[PDB]
Structure 1
Amino acid sequence: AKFFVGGNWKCNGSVANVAKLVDELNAGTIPRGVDVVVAPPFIYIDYVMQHLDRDKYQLSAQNAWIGGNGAFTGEVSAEQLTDFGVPWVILGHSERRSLFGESNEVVAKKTSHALAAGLGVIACIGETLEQRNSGSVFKVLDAQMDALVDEVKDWTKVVLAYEPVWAIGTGVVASPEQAQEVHAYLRQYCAKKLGAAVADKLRIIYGGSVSDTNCKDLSKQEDIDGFLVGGASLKGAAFVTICNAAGPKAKP
């Protein structure tokens, strides 16, 4: 029910800058009834967990391994994250689908593994400019979702994040109307695959370029339940403003 805002810091930070960002976030006020998650690089999670106000913010990781602990040098498991006290993980971000070749199948299995390990998952999908140019939007999104549906039985702790990758680094802007068109499409897909009750409660958050300038134009769209924020999450007051875009979608 709650408007949901996640802040994906990506691969950014230093000890001093993280300390400063945490202080700025702690200075902000968040409306009742909004869920706000902050996702630092792995090395900072300890510090952030210990210094960021728990009344306002929950922690997320930016990725996790496909399975449990073992001989996977460099990786962090969902079991480790849960044991650490982290409640959320972002999985299938466009940067990992592209740079790391995470397939639809890998994202879906990471998601079911993480859920079974006790995390909530911000599961990311989205199509590129080439795919939109070729008339493949439905084919691509349907296949991304079909893979998730195959792995996930309980969507209570899933948040679905749509990334308009065609409008990320291409010189193209996505309008709020274009965003809403996709979110409406995803909503009706999910109603058919999961049932109208599950689809109505599922948070479908927008992960295009979200700033303190455009957040209210996006948050008023019928099927946009929140945001997965990129670079604006690195600026505390701007990020807090995005969290305050909930308006009537906050569920105090």
Structure 2
Amino acid sequence: AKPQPIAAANWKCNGTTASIEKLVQVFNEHTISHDVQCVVAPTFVHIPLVQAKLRNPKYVISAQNAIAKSGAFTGEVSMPILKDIGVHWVILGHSERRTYYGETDEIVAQKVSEACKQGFMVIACIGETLQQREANQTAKVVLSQTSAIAAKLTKDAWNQVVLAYEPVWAIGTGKVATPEQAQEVHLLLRKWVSENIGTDVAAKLRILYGGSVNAANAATLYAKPDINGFLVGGASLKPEFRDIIDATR
């Protein structure tokens, strides 16, 4: 049987108080009748607003990034500060942070390790570029990113980890991966975890697909055996996020 699916909304750097209040009411009035964990990740300045308005019991709030420790780091938000305000989910290693803001595999693996030590649920992102994919390096890249994270974790910490595979060429481009492309990578990741970490760990691990997911292609992706849900960018800012959630039934 599949583990519990996740439908995660990453709002990236978007939103106004007016537009967030309306969308959150749309999420609140949508009744979800199956077992799914819904996740909303707003910008840091909107966490308090979302905490005050979001009432749907299937949802939790996540930060879009964090650093491990408080201190002299002007502009950043740390894990202890998020925990103190009630946030215990975080997205780490998003492609945009790896590309624009210098997060290497080592930096992402250290952040994931620290988040696990501080009790967070982590959504760790991995994925290849179009250049790597055309050079037939997809497997090597995704397994190198994953084993760099695995090297800093203990077996028990895998209980707090969610992997999100998002090919860089599918992010915000409208070119979603086919169900078959996504399933082959998810299967390869699950097998690697099964062999290197444990078969019990592999059976429970959620591996999500992200990159141009919308309400019409979600159900076809979710039909594949090793896809456990989605990380959604642009479609999570709209009311069709409701039908993405309902595609994990």
TM-score, scaled to structure 1: 0.94
Whole-Å Cα distance in 1 between the matches of residues 52 and 243 of structure 2? 23
Most deviating of 7-16 and 131-140: 131-140
Unaligned runs of 5+ in 1: 248-252
Which residue number in structure 2 is paired with residue 227 of structure 1? 230
Which residue number in structure 2 is paired with residue 26 of structure 1? 28
Alignment of 1:165-176 (within 5 A): 165-168=168-171, 172-176=175-179
User: Which fold has the larger relative contact order, with Cα–Cα distance below 8 Å and residues 6 or more apart in sequence?
Assistant: 1
Whole-Å Cα distance in 1 between the matches of residues 27 and 87 of structure 2? 18
Partner amino acid for 1:152?
L
Whole-Å Cα distance in 1 between the matches of residues 118 and 65 of structure 2? 14
In structure 2, the CA distance between the partners of 1:38 and 1:9, relative to structure 1 (3 Å rule), is: same
Q: CA deviation at 1:52?
A: 0.1
Q: CA deviation at 1:127?
A: 0.4
Q: Indicate which of 172, 178, 181 corresponds to 1:178.
A: 181
Alignment of 1:1-252 (within 5 A): 1-65=3-67, 67-153=68-154, 154-168=157-171, 172-236=175-239, 238-247=240-249
Q: CA deviation at 1:61?
A: 0.5
Q: CA deviation at 1:87?
A: 2.1
Contact 1:6 1:36 in 2 (8 A): yes
Q: CA deviation at 1:56?
A: 2.5
Whole-Å Cα distance in 1 between the matches of residues 179 and 139 of structure 2? 19
Whole-Å Cα distance in 1 between the matches of residues 194 and 151 of structure 2? 15
Partner amino acid for 2:25?
D
SS in 1 for 2:208: strand
Partner amino acid for 2:86?
G
Q: CA deviation at 1:170?
A: 5.8
Whole-Å Cα distance in 2 between the matches of residues 229 and 169 of structure 1? 10
Contact 1:29 1:240 in 2 (8 A): no
SS in 2 for 1:6: strand
1:25-52 superposed Cα distances (whole Å, 9 cap, x missing partner) = 1111222310001000000000101110
Which residue number in structure 2 is paired with residue 250 of structure 1? none
SS in 1 for 2:215: coil
Q: CA deviation at 1:63?
A: 0.3
Q: RMSD in angstroms over aligned alpha carbons?
A: 1.3
Aligned length: 245
Q: Percent identity?
A: 53
